Each structure stands twice: as structure tokens, then as C-alpha cells.
Amino acid sequence: STGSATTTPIDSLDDAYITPVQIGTPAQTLNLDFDTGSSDLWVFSSETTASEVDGQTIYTPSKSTTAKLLSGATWSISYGDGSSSSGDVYTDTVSVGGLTVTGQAVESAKKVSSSFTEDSTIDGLLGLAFSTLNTVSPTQQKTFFDNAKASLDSPVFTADLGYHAPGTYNFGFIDTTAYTGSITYTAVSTKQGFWEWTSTGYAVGSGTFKSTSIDGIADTGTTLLYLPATVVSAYWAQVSGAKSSSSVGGYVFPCSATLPSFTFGVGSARIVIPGDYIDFGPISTGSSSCFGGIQSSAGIGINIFGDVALKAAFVVFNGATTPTLGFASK
Numbered sequence: 001s002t003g004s005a006t007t008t009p010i011d012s013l014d015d016a017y018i019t020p021v022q023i024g025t026p027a028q029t030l031n032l033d034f035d036t037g038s039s040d041l042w043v044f045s046s047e048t049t050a051s052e053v054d055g056q057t058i059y060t061p062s063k064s065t066t067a068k069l070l071s072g073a074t075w076s077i078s079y080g081d082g083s084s085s086s087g088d089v090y091t092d093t094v095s096v097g098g099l100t101v102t103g104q105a106v107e108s109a110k111k112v113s114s115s116f117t118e119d120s121t122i123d124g125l126l127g128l129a130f131s132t133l134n135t136v137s138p139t140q141q142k143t144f145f146d147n148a149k150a151s152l153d154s155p156v157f158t159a160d161l162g163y164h165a166p167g168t169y170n171f172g173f174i175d176t177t178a179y180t181g182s183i184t185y186t187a188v189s190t191k192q193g194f195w196e197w198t199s200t201g202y203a204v205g206s207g208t209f210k211s212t213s214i215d216g217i218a219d220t221g222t223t224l225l226y227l228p229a230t231v232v233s234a235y236w237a238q239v240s241g242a243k244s245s246s247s248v249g250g251y252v253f254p255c256s257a258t259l260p261s262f263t264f265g266v267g268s269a270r271i272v273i274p275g276d277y278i279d280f281g282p283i284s285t286g287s288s289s290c291f292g293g294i295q296s297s298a299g300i301g302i303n304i305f306g307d308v309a310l311k312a313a314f315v316v317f318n319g320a321t322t323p324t325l326g327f328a329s330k
């Protein structure tokens, strides 16, 4: 089997991407944020505290003839940005782009934090990291990908995120028309439960490539590119007037700037992030200070190749017995 679904930015900044997902019988379609940095499929639901729902589409398990309470199971998750959610668990039929999994754990939110409530466009998350990170207790549950894997033509999924435009998540096949040149594959460590890999270095604009190992995670559910302070300082030093603002929470730059590109290495290959991809617009409405798309990972504890980096590439998440990651230009 295979599946193919379009993923769409939630706003004009590409802050996140949502992908329609069919849950239950008859189908209830919710728009979920596919997140390769977590391993829970959770949704706004008829159980979510009413004051914490503001415009989201909800899953109502009592209206699904295939829903079954997973007795005794609860979940609770915190994300890198400090947001959180928790609740109980159903199993139900879940389909993505024509690919169907029966008996998928669908984690029903009873509580969500404020940045979920305030994000009316995101109806929940679909985790695509390794199932060892799944938070369901007392019996850990598998991700949609892990459940689907055995049925897939090939044990892979691909992320092709657009810049200010829709893109595609495919399951079970590599669309050879969706990228240019060749795909370069690189080793993955699953020891922390993430798609963790080591970039071979970077360049700023038309500058020389610096060969240096940068360990980080491929994370579709994080907006920005978080890298070591040394690398980030070297980037922003090429933008007149750019500075790190403790009050804003990172590097800002004059909105009048033209930003340089940023290149990262994948083995001997190179992925170029155009300068425009690094512009996240005014820090507040009407401000001439703009927020940067490359930020320091210092104090996160890990480097994160978030959407800013991933949307410059066609990315293969290879879930074979020994997982690997592939990157191609596009």
C-alpha cells in the first residue's frame, strides 16, 4: 500500500503545516500537524475542556462505530516549546492520503495548553518519530507509520514541505519526480527516539563551506533551524544590524535586509536554504524588527533541523530495520 496527502502552511509565515487525516467511521476529518519530533497522535475531541477549544475541529469517538476506549490508558506530553496536552485513549481507524491503519491509538485530549487553544488551525498532532517516545501509559502505543509499515510497498515516508505553498507527505514510496539530482542518505541514531543525524557542515551565503559535524534531529514539527551558537553567530554577522535580543528571545534583523542563504551538508552533498526562507517577519505588527529563522540551540540541548531547513529539501524518512535519512534538492 501507499498514501499521499497534501500538507498546507497554517499561515503566511509557514509557522507549521497541517495535513487532513480521516479518523473513525464514518470518517471525521481533522487537520493534524505531522511531527517527526514526537510519537503521539492526539486530537482535540468531545472530551477537551470546553474553555480550551477555540475553533478547532474535534473528534467525537461516540459518533464512530469503530472507536473503542483503550481501557485504563492515559497520555501526557510536553513539547520543546513548553506546550503540553494530555488525556485518554481510543483505538480507531485512521487514514492518511488513502493509506488506512486499523486499531490506531488516537489520543483524545482532555487538556491542552494555551498555544494549542490559540492555534485554531491545528486540530492535533500526528507523531512520526520512533514509537519509543510515545507517552501512553501503562501500555506504550505505536505511531501511525509503525503500524502501517508492514503493509507499505517500501518502509518509508517522505516530507516535501513548501515555501509559502502546499507540499506533500507520501507513505510507502519515493516520488522520483519530486526532487532534482540524487538523494543522499545519511546514518540515523534512534537512541533518543528521534530521527537524529549528523550534518557535515555549513556555509553562509557565498562563503566557503566549513566542514564540521553537527548532530541534530530532523523535525517537521518545529518551525525554525536551531544550531550551535558559533554557527548562528557566523550567519547573523553577515546581516547588517542583526542582533540577539534577550527581550524578544533570539536573533532579530532589520526588516529592510536582504538575507544570505544558508547551506548545510549531508555527506558530500549540500542543501541550500534561500535567504527568504529565513525571514519570519515583524516581531509584532508594524515593527521594522524581523525575527530570524536560524536561532541558537544553546539551552535546548539538541540541534534541530526544523521546517526552515527541511522545506529546502525532499526528505526521506527510511524506516527500514536500520533507519536512515535521505535529502535531495528540489
Ligand SMILES: Cn1cccc1CNCCc1c[nH]c2ccccc12
Pocket: 015, 016, 119, 223, 248, 249, 283, 291
Ligand atoms: C519566536 N517568536 C518571536 C516573536 C514571536 C514569536 C513566536 N511566533 C509563534 C508563531 C506561531 C504561531 N502558531 C504557531 C504554531 C507552531 C509554531 C509556531 C507558531
